[PDB]
# Entry
Amino acid sequence: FVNQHLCGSHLVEALYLVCGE
Amino acid sequence: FVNQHLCGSHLVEALYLVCGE
Amino acid sequence: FVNQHLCGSHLVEALYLVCGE
Amino acid sequence: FVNQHLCGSHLVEALYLVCGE
Amino acid sequence: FVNQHLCGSHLVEALYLVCGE
Amino acid sequence: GIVEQCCTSICSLYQLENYCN
Amino acid sequence: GIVEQCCTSICSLYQLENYCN
Amino acid sequence: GIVEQCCTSICSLYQLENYCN
Amino acid sequence: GIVEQCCTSICSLYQLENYCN
Amino acid sequence: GIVEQCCTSICSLYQLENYCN
# Structure
């Protein structure tokens, strides 16, 4: 689940999701 | 499941989905 | 769970969530 | 649980939460 | 539990909370 | 799942979801 | 599944879905 | 899950969620 | 969970939550 | 939990919460 809404300059988003840890 | 709506300049989206981890 | 709303210059947020510790 | 509302210059907040100590 | 409200110059607050001592 | 929406933007996002099963 | 919609855009997206069975 | 919303911004966010199961 | 909201700001936040289970 | 609110400020805060269980 990742909701990203961008309306600008240089939007850097990093999502890492993992189960089993 | 990936929903991408772009109306701009240089839209770089990377989706990696995997089960079995 | 991370809610980020940015409307400025140089927004650096780092979230690390993990269970099993 | 961390609530951060910033409207200024150079906001450096470091949160470290952990249970099991 | 830490409540910090700042509206000035150079606000340095250090909180360390731990139980099990 | 992830969802990216960019209007007047240059977007650089990487979202990776790894699930148990 | 993935769904890309670009109006006035240059879009660069990579979406890879690997499923158990 | 994480949710990023940037209007007039340059955003640099890294959100990583690692779950037990 | 963490929640960051920045208006006219340069924000530098690091929030790490490690939970038992 | 911690909560930081900065208006016209330069804020430098470090809040670490370590709990038994």
Summary: Chain C is about 0% helix and 75% strand. Chain C touches chain A at residues 18-20 (CB under 8 Å). The longest strand of chain C covers residues 9-19. Residues 11 and 19 of chain C are 26 Å apart (CA to CA).
